[PDB]
Design an enzyme around this catalytic site. Structure first.
Site, PDB file in Angstrom:
ATOM      1  CG  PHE A  12      -2.009   1.053   1.471  1.00 30.78           C
ATOM      2  CD1 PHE A  12      -3.165   0.868   0.985  1.00 30.78           C
ATOM      3  CD2 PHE A  12      -1.641   2.110   2.156  1.00 30.78           C
ATOM      4  CE1 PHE A  12      -4.318   1.927   0.882  1.00 30.78           C
ATOM      5  CE2 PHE A  12      -2.717   3.168   2.056  1.00 30.78           C
ATOM      6  CZ  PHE A  12      -4.111   2.919   1.577  1.00 30.78           C
TER       7      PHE A  12
ATOM      8  CB  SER B 214       3.334   7.561   3.192  1.00 30.18           C
ATOM      9  OG  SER B 214       2.119   7.392   4.213  1.00 30.18           O
TER      10      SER B 214
ATOM     11  CD1 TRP C 290       6.773   7.493   5.284  1.00 28.23           C
ATOM     12  CD2 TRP C 290       8.692   6.404   6.148  1.00 28.23           C
ATOM     13  NE1 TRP C 290       7.715   8.475   5.751  1.00 28.23           N
ATOM     14  CE2 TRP C 290       8.684   7.913   6.434  1.00 28.23           C
ATOM     15  CE3 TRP C 290       9.459   5.497   6.564  1.00 28.23           C
ATOM     16  CZ2 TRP C 290       9.861   8.146   7.051  1.00 28.23           C
ATOM     17  CZ3 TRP C 290      10.428   5.837   7.294  1.00 28.23           C
ATOM     18  CH2 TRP C 290      10.750   7.118   7.304  1.00 28.23           C
TER      19      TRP C 290
ATOM     20  CD  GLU D  19      12.099  -0.991  33.238  1.00 29.21           C
ATOM     21  OE1 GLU D  19      11.699  -0.104  32.590  1.00 29.21           O
ATOM     22  OE2 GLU D  19      12.036  -0.987  34.385  1.00 29.21           O
TER      23      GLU D  19
ATOM     24  N   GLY E 160      18.924  -8.227  32.235  1.00 27.09           N
ATOM     25  CA  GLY E 160      19.846  -8.090  31.169  1.00 27.09           C
ATOM     26  C   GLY E 160      19.462  -8.980  29.937  1.00 27.09           C
TER      27      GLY E 160
ATOM     28  CD  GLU F 223      -3.804   1.737   8.630  1.00 21.70           C
ATOM     29  OE1 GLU F 223      -3.122   0.631   8.450  1.00 21.70           O
ATOM     30  OE2 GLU F 223      -4.376   2.684   7.941  1.00 21.70           O
TER      31      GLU F 223
ATOM     32  CB  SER G  65      -0.372   9.317  19.517  1.00 19.30           C
ATOM     33  OG  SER G  65       0.142   7.937  19.727  1.00 19.30           O
TER      34      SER G  65
HETATM   35  C1  LIG Z   1       7.424   1.152   9.994  1.00 17.81           C
HETATM   36  C2  LIG Z   1       6.347   2.062   8.999  1.00 17.81           C
HETATM   37  C3  LIG Z   1       5.479   1.710   8.259  1.00 17.81           C
HETATM   38  C4  LIG Z   1       4.689   2.227   7.320  1.00 17.81           C
HETATM   39  N1  LIG Z   1       4.004   1.703   6.364  1.00 17.81           N
HETATM   40  C5  LIG Z   1       3.413   2.623   5.522  1.00 17.81           C
HETATM   41  C6  LIG Z   1       2.919   1.691   4.447  1.00 17.81           C
HETATM   42  O1  LIG Z   1       3.105   0.649   4.170  1.00 17.81           O
HETATM   43  N2  LIG Z   1       2.319   2.582   3.494  1.00 17.81           N
HETATM   44  C7  LIG Z   1       2.211   3.843   3.779  1.00 17.81           C
HETATM   45  O2  LIG Z   1       1.894   4.760   2.673  1.00 17.81           O
HETATM   46  N3  LIG Z   1       2.793   4.505   4.508  1.00 17.81           N
HETATM   47  C8  LIG Z   1       3.209   3.701   5.740  1.00 17.81           C
HETATM   48  N4  LIG Z   1       3.896   4.496   6.674  1.00 17.81           N
HETATM   49  C9  LIG Z   1       3.838   5.914   6.813  1.00 17.81           C
HETATM   50  C10 LIG Z   1       2.955   6.432   7.922  1.00 17.81           C
HETATM   51  O3  LIG Z   1       1.717   6.644   7.691  1.00 17.81           O
HETATM   52  C11 LIG Z   1       3.551   7.919   8.500  1.00 17.81           C
HETATM   53  O4  LIG Z   1       4.971   7.819   9.042  1.00 17.81           O
HETATM   54  C12 LIG Z   1       2.632   8.657   9.398  1.00 17.81           C
HETATM   55  O5  LIG Z   1       1.544   9.148   8.632  1.00 17.81           O
HETATM   56  C13 LIG Z   1       3.435   9.923   9.870  1.00 17.81           C
HETATM   57  O6  LIG Z   1       3.769  10.633   8.943  1.00 17.81           O
HETATM   58  P1  LIG Z   1       5.121  11.416   8.899  1.00 17.81           P
HETATM   59  O7  LIG Z   1       6.203  10.057   9.039  1.00 17.81           O
HETATM   60  O8  LIG Z   1       5.580  12.291   7.821  1.00 17.81           O
HETATM   61  O9  LIG Z   1       5.075  12.314  10.201  1.00 17.81           O
HETATM   62  P2  LIG Z   1       4.608  13.760  10.517  1.00 17.81           P
HETATM   63  O10 LIG Z   1       3.252  13.838   9.956  1.00 17.81           O
HETATM   64  O11 LIG Z   1       5.874  14.756   9.985  1.00 17.81           O
HETATM   65  O12 LIG Z   1       4.375  13.874  12.073  1.00 17.81           O
HETATM   66  C14 LIG Z   1       5.436  14.349  12.851  1.00 17.81           C
HETATM   67  C15 LIG Z   1       4.856  14.449  14.222  1.00 17.81           C
HETATM   68  O13 LIG Z   1       3.834  15.643  14.191  1.00 17.81           O
HETATM   69  C16 LIG Z   1       2.660  15.301  14.685  1.00 17.81           C
HETATM   70  N5  LIG Z   1       1.639  15.993  13.879  1.00 17.81           N
HETATM   71  C17 LIG Z   1       1.621  16.458  12.515  1.00 17.81           C
HETATM   72  N6  LIG Z   1       0.399  17.156  12.100  1.00 17.81           N
HETATM   73  C18 LIG Z   1      -0.133  17.374  13.326  1.00 17.81           C
HETATM   74  C19 LIG Z   1      -1.334  18.037  13.746  1.00 17.81           C
HETATM   75  N7  LIG Z   1      -2.151  18.591  13.126  1.00 17.81           N
HETATM   76  N8  LIG Z   1      -1.506  18.020  14.977  1.00 17.81           N
HETATM   77  C20 LIG Z   1      -1.018  17.522  15.991  1.00 17.81           C
HETATM   78  N9  LIG Z   1       0.411  16.905  15.898  1.00 17.81           N
HETATM   79  C21 LIG Z   1       0.620  16.720  14.433  1.00 17.81           C
HETATM   80  C22 LIG Z   1       2.442  13.801  14.254  1.00 17.81           C
HETATM   81  O14 LIG Z   1       1.443  13.296  15.240  1.00 17.81           O
HETATM   82  C23 LIG Z   1       4.000  13.229  14.946  1.00 17.81           C
HETATM   83  O15 LIG Z   1       4.261  13.290  16.146  1.00 17.81           O
HETATM   84  C24 LIG Z   1       4.775   3.743   7.655  1.00 17.81           C
HETATM   85  C25 LIG Z   1       5.619   4.373   8.526  1.00 17.81           C
HETATM   86  C26 LIG Z   1       6.234   3.534   9.142  1.00 17.81           C
HETATM   87  C27 LIG Z   1       7.341   4.291  10.333  1.00 17.81           C
HETATM   88  C1  LIG Z   2      23.753  -3.489  28.624  1.00 16.21           C
HETATM   89  C2  LIG Z   2      24.333  -3.939  30.127  1.00 16.21           C
HETATM   90  C3  LIG Z   2      25.562  -3.362  30.508  1.00 16.21           C
HETATM   91  C4  LIG Z   2      26.142  -3.881  31.835  1.00 16.21           C
HETATM   92  N1  LIG Z   2      27.273  -3.660  32.099  1.00 16.21           N
HETATM   93  C5  LIG Z   2      27.697  -4.376  33.217  1.00 16.21           C
HETATM   94  C6  LIG Z   2      29.377  -4.236  33.360  1.00 16.21           C
HETATM   95  O1  LIG Z   2      29.960  -3.642  32.369  1.00 16.21           O
HETATM   96  N2  LIG Z   2      29.525  -5.264  34.327  1.00 16.21           N
HETATM   97  C7  LIG Z   2      28.726  -5.943  35.087  1.00 16.21           C
HETATM   98  O2  LIG Z   2      29.372  -6.788  36.075  1.00 16.21           O
HETATM   99  N3  LIG Z   2      27.551  -6.058  34.992  1.00 16.21           N
HETATM  100  C8  LIG Z   2      27.026  -5.394  34.050  1.00 16.21           C
HETATM  101  N4  LIG Z   2      25.632  -5.468  33.796  1.00 16.21           N
HETATM  102  C9  LIG Z   2      24.896  -6.375  34.391  1.00 16.21           C
HETATM  103  C10 LIG Z   2      23.666  -5.688  35.103  1.00 16.21           C
HETATM  104  O3  LIG Z   2      24.382  -5.300  36.477  1.00 16.21           O
HETATM  105  C11 LIG Z   2      22.695  -6.873  35.494  1.00 16.21           C
HETATM  106  O4  LIG Z   2      21.845  -6.929  34.358  1.00 16.21           O
HETATM  107  C12 LIG Z   2      21.670  -6.058  36.669  1.00 16.21           C
HETATM  108  O5  LIG Z   2      22.275  -6.445  37.994  1.00 16.21           O
HETATM  109  C13 LIG Z   2      20.335  -6.994  36.608  1.00 16.21           C
HETATM  110  O6  LIG Z   2      20.707  -8.334  36.958  1.00 16.21           O
HETATM  111  P1  LIG Z   2      20.036  -9.403  35.966  1.00 16.21           P
HETATM  112  O7  LIG Z   2      20.071  -9.103  34.486  1.00 16.21           O
HETATM  113  O8  LIG Z   2      20.480 -11.021  36.237  1.00 16.21           O
HETATM  114  O9  LIG Z   2      18.573  -9.408  36.055  1.00 16.21           O
HETATM  115  P2  LIG Z   2      17.573  -9.962  37.428  1.00 16.21           P
HETATM  116  O10 LIG Z   2      18.480  -9.684  38.882  1.00 16.21           O
HETATM  117  O11 LIG Z   2      17.275 -11.549  37.122  1.00 16.21           O
HETATM  118  O12 LIG Z   2      16.215  -9.247  37.607  1.00 16.21           O
HETATM  119  C14 LIG Z   2      15.372  -9.556  36.707  1.00 16.21           C
HETATM  120  C15 LIG Z   2      14.083  -8.511  37.191  1.00 16.21           C
HETATM  121  O13 LIG Z   2      13.789  -8.982  38.676  1.00 16.21           O
HETATM  122  C16 LIG Z   2      13.748  -7.756  39.334  1.00 16.21           C
HETATM  123  N5  LIG Z   2      14.211  -8.104  40.749  1.00 16.21           N
HETATM  124  C17 LIG Z   2      15.223  -8.847  41.334  1.00 16.21           C
HETATM  125  N6  LIG Z   2      15.316  -9.102  42.558  1.00 16.21           N
HETATM  126  C18 LIG Z   2      14.215  -8.240  43.010  1.00 16.21           C
HETATM  127  C19 LIG Z   2      13.713  -8.089  44.306  1.00 16.21           C
HETATM  128  N7  LIG Z   2      14.317  -8.566  45.462  1.00 16.21           N
HETATM  129  N8  LIG Z   2      12.464  -7.308  44.241  1.00 16.21           N
HETATM  130  C20 LIG Z   2      12.050  -6.887  43.298  1.00 16.21           C
HETATM  131  N9  LIG Z   2      12.332  -7.057  41.969  1.00 16.21           N
HETATM  132  C21 LIG Z   2      13.351  -7.709  41.765  1.00 16.21           C
HETATM  133  C22 LIG Z   2      14.593  -6.664  38.606  1.00 16.21           C
HETATM  134  O14 LIG Z   2      14.464  -5.683  39.081  1.00 16.21           O
HETATM  135  C23 LIG Z   2      14.241  -7.141  37.176  1.00 16.21           C
HETATM  136  O15 LIG Z   2      13.254  -6.239  37.120  1.00 16.21           O
HETATM  137  C24 LIG Z   2      25.103  -4.947  32.451  1.00 16.21           C
HETATM  138  C25 LIG Z   2      23.765  -5.233  32.196  1.00 16.21           C
HETATM  139  C26 LIG Z   2      23.416  -4.874  30.755  1.00 16.21           C
HETATM  140  C27 LIG Z   2      22.209  -5.187  30.270  1.00 16.21           C
END
Ligand SMILES: Cc1cc2nc3c(=O)[nH]c(=O)nc-3n(C[C@H](O)[C@H](O)[C@H](O)COP(=O)(O)OP(=O)(O)OC[C@H]3O[C@@H](n4cnc5c(N)ncnc54)[C@H](O)[C@@H]3O)c2cc1C
Ligand SMILES: Cc1cc2nc3c(=O)[nH]c(=O)nc-3n(C[C@H](O)[C@H](O)[C@H](O)COP(=O)(O)OP(=O)(O)OC[C@H]3O[C@@H](n4cnc5c(N)ncnc54)[C@H](O)[C@@H]3O)c2cc1C
Lengths: 376, 369
Positions: free
Chosen positions: B115, B118, B148, B326, B330, B353, B356
């Site tokens: 379709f 755009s 798009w 979350e 990790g 479509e 918001s």
């Molecule tokens: C992954 C993806 C798939 C798509 N698939 C298709 C498809 O298959 N075919 C197709 O034809 N199109 C497709 N689209 C296009 C899509 O419909 C447009 O991206 C969308 O209509 C928004 O237009 P824009 O990107 O130009 O944003 P803009 O229209 O530039 O909007 C930018 C921002 O301004 C806001 N805004 C704009 N005007 C107003 C207003 N009057 N009041 C308040 N806020 C406003 C918008 O809400 C938005 O937050 C696709 C888009 C994406 C990202």
């Molecule tokens: C991009 C990235 C970079 C990182 N960099 C480093 C780094 O360089 N070195 C390093 O050593 N580590 C690093 N970490 C690891 C990071 O510190 C851990 O991912 C983090 O401590 C969470 O542990 P987990 O992923 O095992 O999640 P989990 O501990 O399994 O947690 C899963 C979920 O359970 C929740 N949860 C756990 N226990 C409780 C509780 N008692 N009460 C409520 N909720 C709970 C957590 O909040 C989370 O929502 C990195 C992680 C990422 C994703």
């Protein structure tokens, strides 16, 4: 002085980082030319004293560095944060005179530091380790597997936590030591310029001279940097939010639909104002929490303020990145603009240096009494 | 019967889509084997009557198909939605008998529909088109560039909107017609199995019999499918949300930290229950809006309900994916689990479509006057 410092990092990030961000994110790499520049311009040694080849600067300057890097590339900011805050910062606090003289000049000049604590089964329960340092003549033999080590594929020096036969213990281990290897393991959604690997130790020899602090003193070594780690991520999240807000504000002035700029609709303008307001509050809290360091402020209060700063900054980063993607419409869903990268990057701030629930557990525990483990 | 239909698509999605989702997302491809199975198992002809070679099902079944596909792969679901709802569905409801008899059997059997409305300067202002259909003997020459177009790199037939020397006009155009080319142009964050391209027309010849409706009838053809398009995306969001909640609930029961499952903590369980509640409401509103079709319901009321269903479902999909990432920690930030892909995919639902802001403007216009 700090205005000049901010402007210098901003200029560096815009000139040296921005043109490489898209490629570093897609390939999960740190550009070799940029790496040489990060070290030369002092972003890898902000608090390291001048006598070890460092900038000799302040916590404030380090927080502004992470913020202004993150405003352009949160992924590069992870490497800068880990190296300065977690690795160099831990050695400044806990290493002997000899260890500081050996490692700090390396970290200040060209060796990247990574921080290897987490494991498959040790996440939020960070010290449930299974990596073991077994006694040997002259030190230890390290064996196990670390998970989530940020910047591991770029690192030269690992700050590693293992059970000494004896409780958790910290070691400095070269990334090219015998028996050390990496397993990238998985693709991560964002902060890809500092993507994680697993780090595998297969009987790696470690000398006693590489042990940071005493045997079983690993948790004390880590705890001293917990607060500062959270301020560094609060800075990364504040910068990310600013970068997202700068992209969305600039776009809203120039994109036209229905015969005029999209900024003239309250449905576009109001979300930006709301984000700007929350971001001013997040930044004010971060800089307050930073200012109360080196004043003899109560340690509990510092822990509280660092947890709150990171919690609030993370939330605002998510909101900013979300609003920025939507403000840009389809373009915001593409790599032609940076905001989809910022959206992928922001989520890492809710997970590392204390998940959202771990922060709220800590904060609530300080407010209502008890320990975090009492909260179910 | 709809319960049987739902289980048949669910089984299909878990067996034939799930094992390929990671690869399709990283490479922005539709797997060739999966493509043949989508046509063979009737997912590409759900409401196309059997007299055209179609499945002969209902709008309700098409909505369930999109939902159950999106519970595993929102990207594959984009391609299913655009083909069934926007292309085949528009021809069924607006094209001439000759056009239906020529094109619906091809859309039912192997030719993917996309379709193309755009453009760079025609987004929310969807009809500010610059692509032109210039008159020539026996039809038109199309020149311009669409932006798009979902699934364009997989498509065989395009529903294209262009200014006919008359206002916006709809055409069916083969993707291999003379002067048609694609420009992938960018990398998109998600729904990458049906990733967009630009579609470029360089004097593409179209015959008069390829025009759907009169000259200046293009808005009417586009707007007439806007309601059903919004229900299709509401189903895609509802399905995405369920898939996120399924992954997070399952993980919360097996991940242990601090000597127990993470589901034992209210900070983990409450967000899942909050999401589950909001998703039950989004799905009830979707199926209400779907049920009121094919009954002579006030068209304004059907437009209000479709806009509200898409707005609510989009919002739930965002919260569900965010909570799921979350909940998994990790692991949730990685491709070892599907939730980071859901999180990237969900944001598309706020853009296509009707953004918001465009939905809220439509709802307010109806309610306030
Ligand atoms: C992954 C993806 C798939 C798509 N698939 C298709 C498809 O298959 N075919 C197709 O034809 N199109 C497709 N689209 C296009 C899509 O419909 C447009 O991206 C969308 O209509 C928004 O237009 P824009 O990107 O130009 O944003 P803009 O229209 O530039 O909007 C930018 C921002 O301004 C806001 N805004 C704009 N005007 C107003 C207003 N009057 N009041 C308040 N806020 C406003 C918008 O809400 C938005 O937050 C696709 C888009 C994406 C990202
Ligand atoms: C991009 C990235 C970079 C990182 N960099 C480093 C780094 O360089 N070195 C390093 O050593 N580590 C690093 N970490 C690891 C990071 O510190 C851990 O991912 C983090 O401590 C969470 O542990 P987990 O992923 O095992 O999640 P989990 O501990 O399994 O947690 C899963 C979920 O359970 C929740 N949860 C756990 N226990 C409780 C509780 N008692 N009460 C409520 N909720 C709970 C957590 O909040 C989370 O929502 C990195 C992680 C990422 C994703």
């Amino acid at each position: 002085e700090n205005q000049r410092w901010r402007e210098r990092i901003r200029h560096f990030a815009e000139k040296e980082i921005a043109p490489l961000s898209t490629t570093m994110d897609r390939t999960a790499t740190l550009d070799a030319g940029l790496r040489e520049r990060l070290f030369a311009e002092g972003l890898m040694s902000v608090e390291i004293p001048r006598g070890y080849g460092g900038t000799g600067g302040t916590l404030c300057q380090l927080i502004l560095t992470i913020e202004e890097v993150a405003r352009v590339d949160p992924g590069v900011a992870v490497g800068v944060h880990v190296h300065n805050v977690l690795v160099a910062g831990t050695l400044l606090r806990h290493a002997s005179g000899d260890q500081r003289r050996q490692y700090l000049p390396q970290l200040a000049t060209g060796k990247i530091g990574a921080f290897a604590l987490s494991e498959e089964q040790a996440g939020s329960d960070a010290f449930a380790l299974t990596t073991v340092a077994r006694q040997d003549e002259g030190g230890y033999l390290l064996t196990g597997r670390k998970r989530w080590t940020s910047n591991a594929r770029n690192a030269d020096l690992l700050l590693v936590f293992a059970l000494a036969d004896g409780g958790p213990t910290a070691f400095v281990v070269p990334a090219d030591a015998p028996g050390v290897s990496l397993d990238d393991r998985v693709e991560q959604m964002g902060v890809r310029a500092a993507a994680t690997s697993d780090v595998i130790f297969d009987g790696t020899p470690v000398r006693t001279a590489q042990r940071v602090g005493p045997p079983g003193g690993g948790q004390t070594v880590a705890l001293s940097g917990l607060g500062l780690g959270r301020l560094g991520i609060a800075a990364q999240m504040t910068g990310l939010a600013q970068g997202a807000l700068d992209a969305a504000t600039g776009y809203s002035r120039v994109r036209e639909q229905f015969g005029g700029r999209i900024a003239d609709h309250q449905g576009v303008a109001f979300p930006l104002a709301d984000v700007a307001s929350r971001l001013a509050a997040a930044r004010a809290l971060l800089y307050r929490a930073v200012d109360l360091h080196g004043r003899g402020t109560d340690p509990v209060e510092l822990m509280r303020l660092a947890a709150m700063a990171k919690y609030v900054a993370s939330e605002v980063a998510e909101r900013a990145a979300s609003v920025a993607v939507e403000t840009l419409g389809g373009n915001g869903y593409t790599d032609a603009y940076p905001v989809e990268r910022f959206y992928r990057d922001a989520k890492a701030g809710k997970i590392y240096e204390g998940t959202s629930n771990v922060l709220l557990r800590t904060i609530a525990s300080i407010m209502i009494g008890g320990s975090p483990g009492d909260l179910e």
